[PDB]
Amino acid sequence: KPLPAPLDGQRKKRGGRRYRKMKERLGLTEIRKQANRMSFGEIEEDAYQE
Amino acid sequence: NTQELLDLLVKCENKIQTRIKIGLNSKMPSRFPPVVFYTPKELGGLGMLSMGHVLIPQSDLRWSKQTDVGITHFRSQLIPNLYRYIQPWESEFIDSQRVWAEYALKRQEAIAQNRRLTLEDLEDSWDRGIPRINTLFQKDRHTLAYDKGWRVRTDFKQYQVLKQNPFWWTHQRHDGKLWNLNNYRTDMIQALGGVEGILEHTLFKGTYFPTWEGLFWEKASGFEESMKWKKLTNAQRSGLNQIPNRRFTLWWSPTINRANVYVGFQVQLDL
Amino acid sequence: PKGYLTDLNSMIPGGDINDIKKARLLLKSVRETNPHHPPAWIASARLEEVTGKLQVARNLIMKGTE
Amino acid sequence: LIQQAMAKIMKANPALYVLRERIRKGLQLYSSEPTEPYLSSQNYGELFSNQIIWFVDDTNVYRVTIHKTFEGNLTTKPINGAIFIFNPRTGQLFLKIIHTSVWAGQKRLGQLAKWKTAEEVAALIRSLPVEEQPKQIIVTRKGMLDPLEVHLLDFPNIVIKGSELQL
Amino acid sequence: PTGEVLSLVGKLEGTRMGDKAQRTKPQMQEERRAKRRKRDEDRHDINKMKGYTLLSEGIDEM
Amino acid sequence: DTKLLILALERLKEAYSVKSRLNQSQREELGLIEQAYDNPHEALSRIKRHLLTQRAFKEVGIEFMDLYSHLVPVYDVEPLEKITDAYLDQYLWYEADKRRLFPPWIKPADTE
Amino acid sequence: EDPSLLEWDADDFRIFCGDLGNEVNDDILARAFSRFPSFLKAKVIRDKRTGKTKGYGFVSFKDPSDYVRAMREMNGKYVGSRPIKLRKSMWKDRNLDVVRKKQKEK
Amino acid sequence: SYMLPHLHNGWQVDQAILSEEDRVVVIRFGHDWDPTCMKMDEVLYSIAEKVKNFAVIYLVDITEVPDFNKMYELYDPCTVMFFFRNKHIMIDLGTGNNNKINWAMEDKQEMVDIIETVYRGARKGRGLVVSPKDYSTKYRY
Amino acid sequence: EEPIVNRGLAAALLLCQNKGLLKDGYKPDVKIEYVDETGRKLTPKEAFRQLSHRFHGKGSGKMKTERRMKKLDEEALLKKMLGTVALLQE
C-alpha cells in the first residue's frame, strides 16, 4: 500500500466529552511530576547507575 | 597492564567526543572545552567518564560573581581517571575472603546471643570484598536462594535478547554492585572547577536564578508536551530526538560560541 | 502423563482474581486506617485465608490480636 | 542614583524578565518551587476574610461496612460516601455524594479514585459561577492536593493549599 | 591545551586503582534502627510470655 | 514451584528493557507474564500440561547480532512457550544443583 | 459602525474567506464568486492607504444551498498563492449586541 | 529499464512542473549511463509508487534537454530538483547548496523523508525547507 | 474576636493584623514601577505586552480587547465583595 499523503488538519476543534476518554486510553493523567524531572542540584541513587 | 588497550580507549574517547563535536558544528573546534563532556548530566553536561589523561586549563577555571558592591573574580588540574575509583581484583578477593570470615564469626556470635546479623552489622563491612555483602540485606534474599544457574543464564541471554549486555558476567541482584562512582562524580565536579565554576560556562547566570539549589530540568517536555505518543512520521521522530540536542547546545552556548573554540567566521546574528 | 494430568484436573479449584485483589486492597486499607478494629482484622484474616496461603492469614490474625 | 537605578532595572525590568523567561523555557529549567503554608492554628484567621476560601474533605468518600456472619462467610459492603466542601465564611457545605456503584466494579486502584475525586471537585468548581468560585482550596488529606493542581489547570487563580489541622 | 584525551598509558601509569574507590554506606540506617526498636518494644509482652502456657505453667495465673 | 515460577517471570520481565515502543509480540508476552504472575496456580497447571503433552511447537524467529567479528544467532520464541521453557529451566537448574549433578569443574559457576 | 455592509447584505449568505495572499486575490475573489452559482458579490476587506488586502473577505451569495456547496468544495482550495479558508460571517451589529445582552441576562 | 517517465524536451519539463498542483514534481537531471544517476533512479523506482499520493518523478536527459543547464547550474553529473506549483523548493541538506541534492543516497527511506519534508513545507508555504538529517558527514565509521 | 471599638484605631489595626490584611551626598530613592492608565500595578508579563504593543505600533484585536475588558470587569466584581437560597430550599 502506498504511503498516505501527509497532511496537517486542525488538531482539535472541540474538547471535553469523549475527547477525555481518548486521552485516558493513551495519555491518561500520569504522575506528571518527578518522572520527567531532573533535580538539577543533587543526585538520586548512584552516580552513574543509569 | 595493557598499553595497547589504553591507547585504544583514548582513541575511542577522542572519537566519541569528535562525534559530539561534529554534531555541534561541521567545522573542527580547535581547543574545544572539555567541560561540556565531563560535566554530570544533572548539571547540564554529558556526564562522560574519562580514561585518558585530560588537562583542564586554568583559563577555564575562572568565574565571576556580581553583588551590589561589584563583580568579584575567582579561580579554582587533571580530569580524574575512572580506574582510580575501581578496586583491583586481587584486593577485591582478599577483602572478600576476610570480610566473609568476619561475617561468619559475627553470624555465629549473633546466633549464640540469639540475634540476627544486622544490615548495620553488614554496614561495618558495607559490601566488603569483591561481592557486595550488602545483598545479605536485600528483601528477595529468600527468593533468590532458588535462582540457581543464574550466571550461565546471564551468559546465554545473548542468544535471546537483541540488546548486547556488557554486564553479562554478573547480576546486580545476586553479586551486588561491585563498583562505586559517587566519589568519582564528586571529584569530577571539584576538578572541573566546582559547581559555580562549571556553571560559569553555562547560561545559568543568564536565567537570573538566585540560587541553583532548588532547580530542576524537564527532560522530554519540549513545546508540545514532548508529543511522545502519536502516529508521527520517522522524520518527526528524528526531530523530536534532536530537540534535546538543541537544549544541550543552548545550555553550553557561552563556552562553545567563543572565538577560542572556532577561529574566523564571526557573523553577527540578524537584528 | 495421563494420570498426572487427571490429578491436575481434580486439583483445579477462589473466584475472580481482580475482585479478590480489590478485596485484599480494601482490607489492607481498612487495617491501615483502623488498626484497632477487630472486624477489620477478622475481614483481613478471612480474605487472606479464603485465598492464597494460611501463613499470611495467621500473620494477619496475630497482627490484629497485637 | 545610577547604582540603585541599575539595581532596580536588573531586579524588575519587564523586558529583561521576558528574556529570562524565554531563556528558561528554551533550557527547560523547571526549577522546583515550594507549596503554600498549611492551615495551622496561626493561619486560620485569614480563612474568614473577603476572599472565598473552601476546605475539601474527601476522607469519608470511600467507606465500607464489614458484616460478619456467624457461619460460612463475612461480607464487606461499600457504602455511599460524601466529599465535603465547606466554606467557613458563608457556612455553605457542599456534600458531593458518591454512590456505592462508582467503586464496586471499577477494577481500579486508588490512583483512579483520587483522580475521580479531583475531577468531581473540578466539576463542582466549574458548575459554580465566577462570582461563587473560591480562590483558595484547603485539602484535608495530604494525598489530594497533588491531583487537585492537575484537575484545576483551567483556573490558575485558585490556590491549592494544604491543611495542618484536620477538620 | 586541546580537548584531546591523552593516553592513560604513561598517564598516571600504575596509578592506584583504589585511589578514588570510595565505598558506599548503607542509607536509611536510622529509620531502619527506629523501626527495629519499635518492633522490639511492641513485642515485649509477647516475648515475655512466649513460653508460658495456660495449662502447663505454675506461674501463669500468679 | 511458586518461587521458581516467580523467578522465571522476573527473569522474563527483566529481559524487556523499557523502551516504550514494543511490538505486538512483546506486549503479548508482557500480558501473559502479568496474567501468570496474578494467578500462579493456573499457569503452573498449564505449564505442567505442556510438559506432559505438547510436542509440536510454533516457528522460532531468528535474527543475527551483528558483532563485526562474527554474527551471533538470536532466537525469538512464542511467549507461552517462553514461559514454559523459563519455568522448566529454573526447575531443572534448582533440582540439578540440589542433587549436585554438575561437577565442580563445570563453570561458569555462580559463586565466582 | 462602518457604513459598508449596506451594498451586499440582501438576505443572502456571507462567507468569510481568509488565509489568502496579502498581495494577491485582489479580484480573484470575483472570479470565484462568478464560478459560484450565485455570483452576487465578492467584496475584499482592505485597508485604505495600505496597498494590500486585510486578509479575510466577504463573499455574498444569494443561493444558500449553492453557497454551502461552494464552501464545501472551496474549503482549502488553492486560490491565488495560498489556500483560502471559508467560514461563516459573524456580522455582530449594535442590534445584535443588544439582543445578545438581553438574552445573556435571561 | 528505467520505468520512470522521461521528458524529451524543455516543453515536456515546463508543463510537467505545472501539471501537478497537489504533488511535488521531482526531476532528475543527468544521464542514465551515469552510475550515480543509476543508483538514484533505482532508489526512486523503489519508492516510485510509495509517494504516488503526494509526489511524482520525471527523468530528464541533459544531452536531450540542455536548456536548463545554465539557469539551474546543471554542471554536476547528476542533480535532483524539487518543484511545487511552479515554485522551486530549496532543501537545507548541509552540503553548502540548498537547491539540488547532487548525490546518490543508497537508503530509500532518506529520500522518502526528504520528499515528505519538501511536501510538508511546500503545502504550508515555506519556499526553503530544512532536511531532517545532516548530509555534510557521510556517517561512516 | 476583637470588635471595632468606638473612638479607637488600635482595634481595627488588630483586627486587620489578625485577619491577615497587612559626591554631593544623598540617598536617592530610585523606585521604578509599572502602572497602567487605570492606575493598577501591572505584572511584568503585562508590562512587557504593553511595551511590545506600543513599540510594534499595533494593539490587540477586537476579540482580545473584549476578553480583556470582560476579565477586568469580572475581577472588579470579585474584588468588590447562595447561602440563603440553600437555607430556604432545605
XYZ file of N, CA and C in Angstrom, chain A residues 36-39, chain B residues 216-222 247, chain D residues 27-31:
51
model
N 9.568 13.153 34.786
C 10.308 13.846 33.742
C 11.189 14.956 34.306
N 11.392 14.973 35.619
C 12.188 15.980 36.302
C 13.601 15.455 36.522
N 14.553 16.382 36.635
C 15.958 16.011 36.725
C 16.603 16.331 38.067
N 16.068 17.285 38.833
C 16.641 17.692 40.118
C 18.081 18.185 39.932
N 15.566 22.367 38.795
C 15.354 21.065 38.179
C 15.073 21.265 36.701
N 15.530 20.313 35.892
C 15.237 20.331 34.471
C 13.858 19.734 34.208
N 13.505 19.647 32.928
C 12.309 18.931 32.481
C 12.716 18.104 31.266
N 13.190 16.887 31.518
C 13.599 16.018 30.424
C 12.372 15.562 29.644
N 12.465 15.634 28.316
C 11.383 15.246 27.415
C 10.091 15.997 27.750
N 10.154 17.320 27.623
C 8.978 18.172 27.752
C 8.684 18.956 26.485
N 9.665 19.688 25.959
C 9.509 20.382 24.696
C 8.458 21.483 24.730
N 18.535 21.714 23.215
C 18.615 22.184 24.597
C 20.051 22.165 25.108
N 15.757 26.410 27.839
C 16.578 25.474 28.593
C 15.762 24.415 29.317
N 14.439 24.563 29.364
C 13.565 23.631 30.078
C 14.022 23.449 31.522
N 14.383 24.565 32.161
C 14.852 24.509 33.572
C 13.647 24.667 34.504
N 12.917 23.574 34.750
C 11.728 23.623 35.641
C 12.193 23.610 37.100
N 12.812 24.705 37.551
C 13.312 24.787 38.948
C 12.173 24.463 39.919
